[PDB]
Design an enzyme around this catalytic site. Structure first.
Site, PDB file in Angstrom:
ATOM      1  N   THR B   1      -7.159   9.588 114.456  1.00 22.75           N
ATOM      2  CA  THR B   1      -6.371  10.554 115.274  1.00 22.75           C
ATOM      3  C   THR B   1      -4.913  10.484 114.883  1.00 22.75           C
ATOM      4  O   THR B   1      -4.259   9.458 115.044  1.00 22.75           O
ATOM      5  CB  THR B   1      -6.504  10.287 116.777  1.00 22.75           C
ATOM      6  OG1 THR B   1      -7.863  10.494 117.171  1.00 22.75           O
ATOM      7  CG2 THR B   1      -5.599  11.223 117.585  1.00 22.75           C
ATOM      8  N   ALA B  49      -9.760   9.479 125.164  1.00 21.00           N
ATOM      9  CA  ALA B  49     -10.010  10.917 125.183  1.00 21.00           C
ATOM     10  C   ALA B  49     -10.177  11.448 126.604  1.00 21.00           C
ATOM     11  O   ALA B  49      -9.722  12.552 126.918  1.00 21.00           O
ATOM     12  CB  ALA B  49     -11.241  11.240 124.336  1.00 21.00           C
TER      13      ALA B  49
END
Lengths: 242, 212, 244, 204, 222, 250, 233, 195, 240
Positions: B1, B49
């Site tokens: 990410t 998340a």
């Protein structure tokens, strides 16, 4: 002295019945629902020339697809309109879709009865019910345009066109003759402005009368004062055409 | 990410990768890491998340409630500080938050705020969050100018994710671009990183370690 | 149910008045008289008791003068019972402010705090209002000496010289002709006794039926010493100023 | 490690013939770094003197808490707080914060104006009342003060000589400890006046 | 010292067609090294052409499905029987998963149906809360055995048209409902041989615009 | 089940005066005579026994009570209302002053805690005022002896000698003339009886006149020796034999 | 004309009656008529709705409670909107915990005891609505009548509301024909429409004014409306 | 970690802060400003734990501003520091403890005095002629002991602060990237742009 | 608890506790508001019947809520402070969480919403206070002037007056205030507000207070001398 819950010998809650007369004292709200949109018209009813008439508000957005009109003691409606935006917003947060009009109206009616003296922990958040009645207009994809009248009675009817306020009796006499299923959005605007003039106690001008519509394409829009001036000039014409 | 956002002449470029892993196993390669808060704010999901997925849809509620009561768009300054107060109450209960709340009003100019689960609220001009953040920084600091063409700035953003996705493990998958103008954000499409690599190698000549 | 027995002590009247707060004013007009005078260099608080028999030991008795810290004394007029309750809530709030800012409480805070307590009972609760009226004499460096009266509405305003209790009107008119701004602490004492001498119900004015306390800056190093007089200083000061 | 030794300090107090003395150091440290040399440890309500040692933040919390009791005590009863009822009071405040207390070692010293008796007492943590008539000690260097006093002290010292005895007790213990040092205050409380002396010592 | 998470193995698979979606899962229910039940369904019809499976911990899973069917009933009673759509339900199950976040559910959830336009839609959840719309997502214990084989036979990933030399990606098709059933059946015959927690039988629920059809197949008992 | 009285039952009658404190002060004037005299070395308090019947014992009833070992009390008015107020007097003396400062409250102090109990019987909701007036005699270390009266309103006063009850008008006139500054606790005892003999028409046995001094400390009632710091209780209710001595001294 | 014992519910009258519970029972005699009747295999609700005026729509009268239980109101709408919500929850509380379809008879008592606890206590308007609750469980078809007093009873057929008596008379005659019509849901709805035509004070049945609901051995609870009731007039 | 430095001279409090903010591997900003103006005459620099500082500095500020509207009066710096010392004492006993340190620099108008108070995170305030926190304190105190005179003018004090930083740059193992220097005198608060 | 339903509808359709509240505002001293080109001016009646009363320390009728929002009031002096405490609170709360000072219209909506709340809470009597909330939004110079009342409804006005003799003052403002053209400057506007008041105060230079609030956070109170000067001019102007 009577409580607040007491029934009359007829079977009607005193306060809830008395409350209906507070609506009769309020200013005029007119609502005509067509197949192209709903038009909301109100008499602002300024009380002085010093009073600035633009700050007065009687039409308010609930969501881009629901609008609301108020008649009665209108500071009570500050509390009702706040509940509505939460139900409508909280409901778009949990299910990713805009409420129906018919479901939103019912949530504000449940809220309405809440008067009492208190028992255990249970909230009773008034001493007397909301002294205001509402014309909830709006549009969903499921049932086109709708128009509702939610009263502190705790009951709501879907209407083709209703008018509440000081001139309620004489206003709804004119609707019963003039409405039919084949009005368009620009004829209803002139039809509200014609009825708004018959029950109005002032001169009709752009400063102290307000129009609002609700279309799918553009959402809920309050007309500026400029647009309303053109429609007021356009009423005087069709009555001199004859 | 690896997510980055950086101010420039025309507003804000937000570029995010796509890959979301659980250890070795690559869970999924299509993760809209950019959350549309409303038509004028973009929030990025980095780190845990769940926390950022849920608490920034809730943040879009409080933006559309504050827009009906006051009847005006909401500051980027106000939108971020609604969110640092939310995660500060929960602190130590174990949530992970790492976002850039990006918006562009007339009175502030294009603005970024970077909200962290520590409780940090930073104003800034270049941000970069995630594991590969250090690689994206390298390419971005040397080629960054306050005055830059909109062609060159889209293309600079795309290259910062490519430079990270190549070296770092977890990032990869696909690049998304967004251009935040005054009217709101426009989505500039998805680019697969496997097909992109041979394109960049060709045009510029960059990348020589790799024989390909 | 409970509604039948309910007095309702918080409703408006048909004319936009509060009956129950009006009546609290009425019961304060029976109690003893209290006067305060503001000089340039001190404050005199002087109050006349409602009791006077000789079996009663008025010598150690204090039911009119209370210290709230070491710079603010109050006088009482009303129910002496009720007044002790508000004085401990004031004593505590005066001290909390010294705890949290290491600086003696301004007179303006401590007065504004008590007023809102009284206001509180006529707003909600259904309790009967308080039956008390205070004169606050206090000293702070911001304005020097200050004087404030509050009544059972909760409205307070400052004063140069004021009086609550019996014949509030009569006491205010005698003071109004005599008071001057160049007064010192000696001059004020003499006007305070004389004014109580003209209003007292009994023609004789005795040292035993008077309570009396001042706040003077003649304590060294720019400080203020509150003294509530002993019965032997009052007696000598009644012969000095020629009231008897 | 221990909360007491993070900030340090030491208090000692004696009696003599119709007077008490009470002394302390002024240093305030954050372990090795020394920060300030003006941090008083002795506070006084009327004619009662109270030395507090230990964690520096509890000192300041307990100093505003006892000023709150003795003020409100003084207005209601209309006489100053007496040393005997003050000892009870210090002990009961500490004790209701039973769990995770203030990390302190208070010392109460003051001549009772009633009987004329000089009077001292010491406390510790939860609230144990140490009753002595000889001398009372607290703080990091409590072991070192005990040694000095016990050999130095003798019953009934006149005020001018008690000042010599308690200076040597404080000054020699402090120099042989790491976490106490700079400056020292000796108060000679006589029955009418209070004399306050700062002592010249080693500033290392 | 109570450890409140158990495990019950099992695997589930969701494939999004063009006008149909399948959710399939094996019926074998284990604990450690004992087989508890041959036949124990995990794929449930919830009404409104939604199918839902929470696979992993069977006790937290069964509970999550009881509460979701409880949320579908209450959707009808309030908005006058407007059918919850697969898009709607997704943001909803996100709110039940996140409602615990300090003693979470410990299940991997998949729902499948037709969205507004009428194309197959699968959603996949994390236990902690977030959710993403996918074309294809496996879950449970043997998920890492079936995913790669599916990326190769649907999306044609890492396959190039012949005689272009990697310069033209292979052309994609649409899948027929008959073809997908054969893919899922091959997957799960492979799965059994190499992983010790799949077998006994596979059950596929196919969701078309006409309703939900069940189909039951035998796998190996060993 | 619920309590829904939260509103004051004491309101201001339209000409001031709180209606309920006026009435209660009348039930305090119906009660039995009770009086107290302060000397320079003690205080005496005395009251008359009232007997339901000749069957009822009267020794079992306490009409004089102890609050602390140095402060005693005696009432006029209603019996039930005094019983509950003496128990609430001992708790609040122990809990906001004995534990916290050690010693027993001073007499000034203790009167104020009891006056707050009275006061909050009209400010608060649902209640009516206590129908009693107290006399509280006591001794503290820094003001000597003192004598107090706490009325159902809440107001308190120091007195040198006072009376309350039905013979209160007659009694205070006599005490006004008889009291002096030099007085023994032995002399006062002779005044306290002589007055209370006029006010009781019933039998004047020393069984039925309860008298109690707050005189000086009793080394014998302490219960333990060997602590020269502690002192005995200053309160001492006299037995029936001893009171029969002072009657034949009339 | 207003009595002296009309204050709270606590008060008894010297006759022995409770007046406030009697006043809430008048709230039923001003609502609109509604007719329920059952055989041994089907229950049926036939309600005549009520518009406010011409431009107005019609006011719902039949609430789907579950998929085997539904009730129809006559009286105040917000009072029913609390009692119908409460039965929904109590029907879910049985399917969750005991996995048992809530028996109709037991749901009557549960409702009753919820009405009682508001006439015992001070404050609390008594509920001013009369329900008919039909349903089909394991013991067959059931139809209940619930008064605002709280008293629930089991009947072969009833009606409530304005001028109900004309319909209740037609049910006392024909009780012996329609009770034996089993395994034929069409004719049992026909007998219910005829009943409510006896109560009309010339309002005239219409396709937008009538609402029927049935439930049976095999059918779920379903409400017919608008075009669906054109066959049954 | 951070550096916050406070030197008081003849008629000014000078406070310095670090421009850098490092969360993890990376330095994120090089212009951040770790100080809030409480009042027209009170400045408060703060430093310490991540994320907690910012919340606790805006809190104090709202209570001090509220008091200024409520009485229409400015609290002396003596009174402000005792209020901040109260709020830290509360938190350390409570469930979640703050770790913040503060220097409060102010110009009392009643006395015509500059005053500087240092409050560490335990809740221990002390008035000083110069203070610091962290490991940065260790390196400064020994220059100030030697050069500092109590009669120094504002312009010399800034020349002594140029010397304190130059010693830090040479010995600390963490970048801080210069300092923002601010003066509080009787005219208000002005930031000198030079280091 | 104590929760009696103090406020209920009568059969005429007005709440009698709210009509009674509004009669209480009539006996109050008089406060006037007029907004010029780019200022507001709040003029208030000081009860000067009182003598031997210090004006240095006595609470005024104009209480600053923020540094650019001022509030004036008529009615019960005691109850007024209760609104002003919740208002000063609300102004700092809004600065804390959204940043940016409150806009005048929002600060009214809060204050007006409190007066509305106390007309439904069982156990509470309505407020006996009507306010004029005036000031300048931040980074703007449009003057704004609002009025709340114990019904809870609020409206903006070009000029307004509350309190005793308000009909006489309002009549003078309907003739002497042109809606199109404000008082040219700050100095002309003060001369319009003083001249309105001198009709119902029947003069006394000490009786009248004038507070002017200007854009950009400039609140100043006109001193006694200034007021006297203006009065003498107007009296002399009008006299001439």
């Amino acid at each position: 002295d009577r409580g607040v819950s007491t029934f009359s010998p007829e079977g009607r809650l005193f306060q809830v019945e008395y409350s209906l007369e507070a609506i009769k004292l309020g200013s005029t709200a007119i609502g005509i629902a067509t197949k192209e949109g709903v038009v909301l018209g109100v008499e602002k009813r300024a009380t002085s020339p010093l009073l600035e008439s633009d700050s007065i508000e009687k039409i308010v957005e609930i969501d881009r697809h629901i609008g609301c009109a108020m008649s009665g003691l209108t500071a009570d409606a500050r509390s009702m309109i706040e509940h509505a935006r939460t139900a409508a917003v909280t409901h778009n947060l949990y299910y990713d879709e805009d409420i129906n009009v018919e479901s939103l109206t019912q949530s504000v009616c449940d809220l309405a009865l809440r008067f009492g003296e208190g028992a255990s922990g249970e909230e009773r958040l008034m001493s007397r019910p909301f002294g205001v009645a509402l014309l909830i207009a709006g549009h969903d994809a499921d049932d086109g345009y709708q128009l509702f009248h939610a009263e502190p009675s705790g009951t709501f009817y879907r209407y083709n066109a209703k008018a509440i306020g000081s001139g309620s009796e004489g206003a709804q006499a004119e609707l019963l003759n003039e409405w039919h299923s084949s009005l368009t959005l620009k004829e209803a605007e002139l039809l509200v402005l014609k009825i708004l003039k018959q029950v109005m106690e002032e001169k009709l001008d752009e400063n102290n009368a307000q129009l609002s519509c609700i279309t799918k394409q553009d959402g809920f829009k309050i007309y500026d004062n400029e647009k309303t001036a053109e429609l007021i000039k356009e009423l005087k014409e069709k009555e001199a055409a004859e | 990410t690896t997510t980055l956002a950086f101010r420039f002449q025309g507003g804000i470029i937000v570029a995010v990768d796509s890959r979301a892993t659980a250890g070795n196993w690559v869970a999924s390669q299509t993760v809209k890491k950019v959350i549309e808060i409303n038509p004028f704010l973009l929030g990025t999901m980095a780190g845990g998340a769940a926390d950022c997925q849920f608490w920034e849809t809730w943040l879009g509620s409080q933006c559309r409630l504050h827009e009906l009561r006051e009847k005006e768009r909401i500051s980027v300054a106000a939108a971020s500080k609604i969110l640092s107060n939310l995660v500060y109450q929960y602190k130590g209960a174990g949530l992970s938050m790492g976002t850039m709340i990006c918006g562009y009003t007339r009175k502030e100019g294009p603005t970024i705020y970077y909200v962290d689960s520590d409780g940090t609220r930073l104003k800034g001009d270049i941000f970069c969050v995630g594991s590969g953040q250090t690689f994206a920084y390298g390419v971005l600091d040397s080629n960054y100018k306050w005055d830059l063409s909109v062609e060159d700035a889209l293309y600079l953003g795309k290259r910062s994710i490519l430079a990270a996705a190549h070296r770092d493990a977890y990032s990869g998958g696909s690049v998304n671009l967004y251009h935040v103008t005054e009217d709101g954000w426009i989505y500039h499409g998805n680019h697969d990183v496997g097909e992109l690599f041979w394109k960049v190698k060709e045009e510029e000549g960059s990348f020589n370690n790799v024989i390909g | 149910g409970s509604r039948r027995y309910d007095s309702r002590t918080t409703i408006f009247s048909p004319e936009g008045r509060l009956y129950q707060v009006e009546y609290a004013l009425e019961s304060i007009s029976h109690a003893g008289t209290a006067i305060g005078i503001m000089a340039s260099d001190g404050i005199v608080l002087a109050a006349e008791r409602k009791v006077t028999s000789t079996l009663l030991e008025q010598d150690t008795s204090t039911e009119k003068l209370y210290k709230l810290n070491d710079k603010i004394a109050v006088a009482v007029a009303g129910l002496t019972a009720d007044a002790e309750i508000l004085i401990n809530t004031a004593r505590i709030h005066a001290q909390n402010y010294l705890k949290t800012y290491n600086e003696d409480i301004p007179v303006e805070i401590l007065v504004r705090r008590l007023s809102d307590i009284k206001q509180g009972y006529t707003q909600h609760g259904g309790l009967r209002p308080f039956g008390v009226s205070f004169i606050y004499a206090g000293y702070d460096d911001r304005y020097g000496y200050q004087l404030y009266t509050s009544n059972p509405s909760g409205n307070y305003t400052g004063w140069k010289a004021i009086s609550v209790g019996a014949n509030t009107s009569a006491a205010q008119t005698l003071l109004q002709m005599d008071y001057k701004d160049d007064m010192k602490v000696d001059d004020a004492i003499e006007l305070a006794l004389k004014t109580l001498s003209k209003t007292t119900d009994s023609s004789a004015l005795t040292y035993d039926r008077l309570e009396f306390a001042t706040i003077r800056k003649g304590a060294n190093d720019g400080e203020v010493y509150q003294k509530i007089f002993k019965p032997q200083e009052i007696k000598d000061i009644l012969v000095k100023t020629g009231i008897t | 490690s221990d909360p007491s030794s993070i900030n340090g300090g030491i208090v000692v107090a004696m009696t003599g013939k119709d007077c008490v003395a009470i002394a302390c150091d002024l240093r305030l440290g954050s372990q090795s770094l020394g920060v300030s040399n003006k941090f008083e440890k002795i506070f006084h309500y009327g004619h009662v003197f109270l030395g507090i040692t230990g964690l520096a933040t509890d000192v300041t919390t307990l100093n505003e808490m006892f000023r709150y009791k003795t003020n409100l005590y003084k207005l209601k009863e209309e006489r100053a707080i007496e040393p005997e009822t003050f000892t009870q009071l210090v002990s009961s405040s500490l004790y209701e914060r039973r769990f995770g207390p203030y990390f302190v070692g208070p010392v109460v010293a003051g001549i009772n104006s009633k009987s004329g008796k000089p009077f001292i007492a010491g406390f510790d943590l939860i609230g144990c009342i140490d009753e002595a008539k000889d001398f009372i000690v607290s703080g990091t260097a409590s072991d070192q003060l005990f040694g000095m006093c016990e050999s130095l002290y003798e019953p009934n010292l006149e005020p001018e000589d008690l000042f010599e005895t308690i200076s040597q007790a404080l000054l020699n213990a402090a120099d042989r400890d790491a976490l106490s040092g700079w400056g020292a205050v000796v108060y000679i409380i006589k029955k009418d006046e209070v004399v306050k002396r700062y002592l010249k010592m080693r500033q290392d | 010292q109570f450890n409140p998470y158990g495990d019950n193995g099992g695997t589930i698979l969701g494939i999004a067609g063009e006008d149909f979606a399948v959710l399939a899962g094996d019926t074998r229910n284990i604990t450690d090294y004992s087989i508890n039940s041959r036949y124990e369904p995990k794929v449930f019809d919830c009404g409104d052409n939604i199918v839902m499976s929470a696979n992993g911990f069977a006790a937290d899973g069964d509970a999550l499905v009881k509460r979701f069917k409880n949320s579908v009933k209450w959707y009808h009673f309030d908005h006058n029987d407007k059918k919850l759509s697969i898009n709607s339900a997704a943001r909803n199950i996100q709110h039940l998963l996140y409602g615990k976040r300090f003693f979470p559910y410990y299940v991997h959830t998949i729902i499948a149906g037709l969205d507004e336009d009428g194309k197959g839609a699968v959603y996949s959840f994390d236990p902690v809360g977030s959710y993403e719309r996918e074309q294809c997502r496996a879950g449970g214990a043997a998920a890492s055995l079936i995913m790669p084989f599916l990326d190769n036979q649907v999306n044609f990933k890492n396959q190039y048209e012949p005689g272009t030399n990697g310069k033209v990606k292979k052309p994609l098709k649409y899948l027929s409902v008959e073809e997908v059933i054969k893919l899922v059946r091959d997957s799960f015959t492979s799965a059994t041989e190499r992983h010790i927690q799949v077998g006994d039988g596979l059950e596929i629920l196919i969701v078309t615009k006409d309703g939900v059809r069940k189909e039951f197949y035998e796998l190996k008992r060993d | 089940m619920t309590d829904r009285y939260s509103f004051s039952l004491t309101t201001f009658s339209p000409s001031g005066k709180l209606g309920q404190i006026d009435y209660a002060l009348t039930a305090v004037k119906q009660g039995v005579t009770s009086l107290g005299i302060k000397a320079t070395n003690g205080v005496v308090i005395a009251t008359e026994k009232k007997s339901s019947s000749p069957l009822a014992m009267s020794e079992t009833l306490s009409k004089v009570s102890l609050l602390t070992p140095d402060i005693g009390a005696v009432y006029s008015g209603m019996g039930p209302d005094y019983r509950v107020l003496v128990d609430k007097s001992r708790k609040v003396a122990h809990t906001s002053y004995k534990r916290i400062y050690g010693e027993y409250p001073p007499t000034k102090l203790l009167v104020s805690e009891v006056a707050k109990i009275m006061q909050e019987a009209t400010q608060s909701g649902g209640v009516r005022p206590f129908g009693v007036s107290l006399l509280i005699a006591g001794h503290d270390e820094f003001n000597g002896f003192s004598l107090y009266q706490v009325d159902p309103s809440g107001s308190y006063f120091p007195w040198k000698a006072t009376a309350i009850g039905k013979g209160s008008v007659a009694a205070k006139t006599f005490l006004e003339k008889r009291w002096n500054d030099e007085l023994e606790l032995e002399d006062a005892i002779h005044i306290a009886l002589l007055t209370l003999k006029e006010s009781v028409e019933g039998e004047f046995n020393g069984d039925t006149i309860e008298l109690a001094i707050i005189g000086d400390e009793n080394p014998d009632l302490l219960g333990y020796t060997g602590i020269p710091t502690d002192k005995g209780p200053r309160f001492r209710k006299l037995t029936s034999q001893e009171i029969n001595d002072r009657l034949e001294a009339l | 004309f207003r009595n002296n014992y009309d204050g709270d519910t606590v008060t008894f009258s010297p006759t022995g009656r409770l007046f406030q519970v009697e006043y809430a029972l008048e709230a039923i005699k001003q609502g609109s008529v509604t007719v329920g009747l059952r055989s041994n295999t089907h229950a049926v609700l036939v309600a005549l709705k009520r518009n406010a005026d011409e431009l107005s729509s019609y006011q719902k009268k039949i609430i789907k409670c579950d998929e085997h239980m539904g009730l129809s109101l006559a009286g105040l709408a917000p009072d029913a909107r609390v009692l119908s919500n409460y039965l929904r929850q109590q029907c879910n509380y049985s399917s969750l915990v005991f996995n048992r379809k809530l028996a109709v008879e037991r749901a009557g008592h549960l409702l009753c005891d919820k009405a009682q606890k508001n006439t015992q206590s001070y404050g609390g308007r008594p509920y001013g609505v009369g329900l008919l609750i039909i349903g089909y469980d394991k013991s067959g078809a059931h139809l209940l009548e619930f008064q605002p007093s709280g008293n629930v009873t089991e009947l072969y057929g009833t009606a409530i509301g304005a001028r109900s008596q004309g319909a209740k008379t037609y049910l006392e005659r024909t009780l012996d024909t329609f009770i034996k019509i089993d395994g034929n849901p069409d004719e049992l709805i026909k007998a219910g429409v005829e009943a409510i035509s006896q109560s009309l004070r010339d309002e005239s049945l219409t396709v937008d004014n009538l609402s029927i609901a049935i439930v049976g051995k095999d059918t779920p609870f379903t409400i017919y409306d608008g075009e669906a009731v054109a066959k049954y007039i | 970690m951070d550096i916050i430095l406070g030197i008081r001279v003849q008629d000014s409090v000078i406070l310095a802060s670090s421009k850098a903010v490092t969360r993890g591997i990376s330095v994120l900003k090089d212009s951040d400003d770790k100080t809030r103006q409480l009042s027209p005459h009170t400045l408060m620099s703060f430093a310490g734990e991540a994320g907690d500082t910012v919340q606790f500095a805006e809190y104090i500020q709202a209570n001090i501003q509220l008091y200024s509207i409520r009485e229409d009066y400015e609290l002396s710096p003596q009174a402000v520091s005792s209020f901040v010392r109260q709020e830290l004492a509360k938190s350390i006993r409570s469930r979640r403890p703050y770790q913040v340190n503060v220097l409060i620099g102010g110009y009392d108008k009643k006395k015509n005095k500059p005053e500087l108070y240092q409050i560490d995170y335990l809740g221990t305030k002390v008035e000083l002629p110069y203070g610091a926190h962290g490991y940065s304190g260790f390196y400064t105190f020994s220059l100030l002991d030697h050069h500092y005179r109590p009669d120094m003018t504002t312009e010399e004090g800034l020349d002594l602060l140029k010397l304190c930083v130059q010693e830090l740059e040479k010995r600390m193992p963490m970048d801080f990237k210069g300092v923002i220097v601010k003066i509080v005198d009787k005219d208000g608060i002005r930031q000198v742009d030079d280091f | 608890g104590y929760d009696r339903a103090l406020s209920i509808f009568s059969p005429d359709g007005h709440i009698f506790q709210v009509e009674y509240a509004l009669e209480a505002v009539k006996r109050g001293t008089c406060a006037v508001g007029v907004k010029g080109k780019n200022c507001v001016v709040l003029g208030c009646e000081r009860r000067s019947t009182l003598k031997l009363q210090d004006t240095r320390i006595t609470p005024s009728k104009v209480s600053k809520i923020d540094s650019h929002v001022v509030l004036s009031f008529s009615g019960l002096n005691a109850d007024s402070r209760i609104l002003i405490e919740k208002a000063r609170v609300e102004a700092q709360s809004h600065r804390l969480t959204l940043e940016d000072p409150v806009t005048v219209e929002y600060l009214t909506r809060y204050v007006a919403g409190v007066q509305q709340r106390y007309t439904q809470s069982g156990g509470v009597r309505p407020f006996g206070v009507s306010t004029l909330i005036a000031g300048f939004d931040p980074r703007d110079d449009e003057p704004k002037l609002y009025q709340t009342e114990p019904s809870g409804i609020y409206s903006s006005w070009s000029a307004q007056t509350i309190g005793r003799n308000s009909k006489t003052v309002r009549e003078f403002l309907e003739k002497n205030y042109d809606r199109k053209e404000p008082p040219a400057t700050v100095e002309e506007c003060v001369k319009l507000t003083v001249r309105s008041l001198l009709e119902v105060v029947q003069t006394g230079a000490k009786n009248i207070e004038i507070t002017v609030v200007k854009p950009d956070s400039d609140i100043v109170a006109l001193s006694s001398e200034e007021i006297n000067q203006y009065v003498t001019q107007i009296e002399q102007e009008k006299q001439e």
